[PDB]
């Protein structure tokens, strides 16, 4: 219903039809210069990862760390 977001500034409020918060970690094509990309938010269900994507899902307000 509310999740932590990538940025501390954006609204924790989830779009209607979610109570799954997620933490998504992966190497994009800048991984060698910048490190892994990180994304926090809401999903309808635990999102379907592609190869190499670390993912952690939880279902309580602002649980995604």
């Amino acid at each position: 219903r509310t999740c932590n977001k990538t940025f501390s500034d954006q609204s924790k409020i989830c779009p209607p039809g979610e109570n799954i918060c997620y933490t998504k970690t992966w190497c994009d094509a800048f991984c060698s210069q910048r490190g892994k990309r990180v994304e926090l938010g809401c999903a309808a269900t635990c999102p379907k990862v592609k190869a190499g994507v670390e993912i952690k899902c939880c279902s309580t307000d602002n649980c995604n760390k």
């Epitope: 500034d9 954006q10 800048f30 910048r34 994304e39």
Partner: antibody
Framework: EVQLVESGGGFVQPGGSLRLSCAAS????????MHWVRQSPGKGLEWVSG???????HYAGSVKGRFTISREDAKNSLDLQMNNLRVDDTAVYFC????????????????????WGQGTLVTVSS | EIVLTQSPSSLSASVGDRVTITCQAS??????LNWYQQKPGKAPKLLIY???SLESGVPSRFSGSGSGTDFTLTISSQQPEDFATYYC?????????FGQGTKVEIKR
């Protein structure tokens, strides 16, 4: 829902001025690099102007000294003031959000243009 | 300024065909190169950033490669919804520039 909605489109005489505006919604506007991209009928895309989250302004050579880009963070608005307009400035103008990607190493701005408004037409004609 | 030249400007594909579009940059742009799709009457949509990284929601049949001056967009199986204009764009240095666009049309 992330929305960029352009307004201020219309017709203007050559040598005339026209202010475009963009109402942003569903993100923390003040944190984002914002851009203007235009497209002449039947032709391709041209970057016009960018304004960084930190206030630095960037203009394409064709528009430098004629166009002024600005933001009002409080009103979630981006403006483009166009002056000394010529026929060849006739285009659909798109409001565009520069990406803001987060890594262990920090924040990176305007790697790409992830959100496009549906664009407003500006016709410069006598 | 950095000029991007796409090839071809138009290509004919059948549904199922593997489609390749080249982007050549007039100077080294590392991997700061993006691919956009545009349909008629509609705004461009980001497919690929950093020369080979897919944007969220983009189907896996889109793939990108290259660095320096030499870049390639691949659609591994052309679908009905993929008949569209594709643009490359460099985010290496101001002013940001686009290739001239590649129109993918139906072969017959």
């Amino acid at each position: 829902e992330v929305q960029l909605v352009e307004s201020g489109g219309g017709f203007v005489q050559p040598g005339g001025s026209l202010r475009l505006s963009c109402a942003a919604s569903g993100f923390t506007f003040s944190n984002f690099d914002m851009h203007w991209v235009r497209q002449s009928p039947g032709k391709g895309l041209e970057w016009v102007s960018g304004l960084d989250h930190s206030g630095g302004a960037h203009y394409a050579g064709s528009v430098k000294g004629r166009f002024t880009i600005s933001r009002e963070d409080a009103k979630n608005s981006l403006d483009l003031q166009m002056n000394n307009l010529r026929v060849d400035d006739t285009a659909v103008y798109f409001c565009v959000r520069g990406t803001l990607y987060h890594y262990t190493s920090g924040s990176y701005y305007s790697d790409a243009f992830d959100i496009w408004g549906q664009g407003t037409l500006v016709t410069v004609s006598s | 300024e950095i000029v991007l030249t796409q090839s071809p400007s138009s290509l004919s594909a059948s549904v199922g065909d593997r489609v390749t579009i080249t982007c050549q940059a007039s100077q080294d742009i590392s991997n700061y190169l993006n691919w956009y799709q545009q349909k008629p009457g509609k705004a461009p949509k980001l497919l690929i950033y950093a020369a080979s990284s897919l944007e969220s929601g983009v189907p896996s049949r889109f793939s990108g490669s290259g660095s320096g001056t030499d870049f390639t967009l691949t659609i591994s199986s052309q679908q009905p919804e993929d008949f569209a204009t594709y643009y490359c764009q460099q985010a290496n240095s101001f002013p940001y520039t686009f290739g001239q666009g590649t129109k993918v049309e139906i072969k017959r």
